[PDB]
Amino acid sequence: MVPGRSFMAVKSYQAQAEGEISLSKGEKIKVLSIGEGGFWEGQVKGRVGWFPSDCLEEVAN
After folding, report:
1. SH3 domain location, by residue?
2. Smallest Cα–Cα separation from 19: which of 52, 53, 47, 50?
3. Domain encompassing residue 9
4. Could you give the residue ranges of the DSSP H alpha helices within the chain?
5. If phi over 0 gives left and psi between -120 and 50 gives alpha, with beta otherwise, what is residue 45?
6. Measured between alpha carbons, how far is 25 from 33 in angstroms, rounded to an integer?
7. Phi, psi of 24 (to 5 degrees)
8. How many domains, in total, are found in the chain?
9. By C-alpha distance, which of 22, 23, 31, 21 is closest to 59?
10. Among 11, 20, 42, 47, which residue has the least CB neighbours within 10 Å?
């Protein structure tokens, strides 16, 4: 439900939809919105949109 802790991307992503955005391995993705399944909205070095959380991972380790 709209998390705060910034998650780090473990892999890059190539936007395919109209509201989808790309990603960058090692880039700190700041989630801003969420939906269902492994998909949610976030921000990456500027690029803010929708994308699969599969390419994202906590920043604990």
Report:
1. 2-61
2. 50
3. 1-61
4. none
5. left
6. 20
7. -140, 120
8. 1
9. 31
10. 11
Q: Which two tokens stand for residue 45?
A: 């070095």
Lookup: tokens for 20: 């989808």
Angle formed at CA 17 by CA 44 and CA 6, multiple of 5 degrees? 20
Could you tell me the two tokens for 36? 């269902």
Q: What is the CATH number for 17?
A: 2.30.30.40
Which of 5, 4, 15 shows the shortest CA–CA distance to 39? 15
| Phi, psi for 53 (deg, rounded to 5) | -70, -10
**47 is written with which tokens?**
């690029």
Experimental method: NMR
User: Which single residue is written with the structure tokens 């509201």?
Assistant: 19
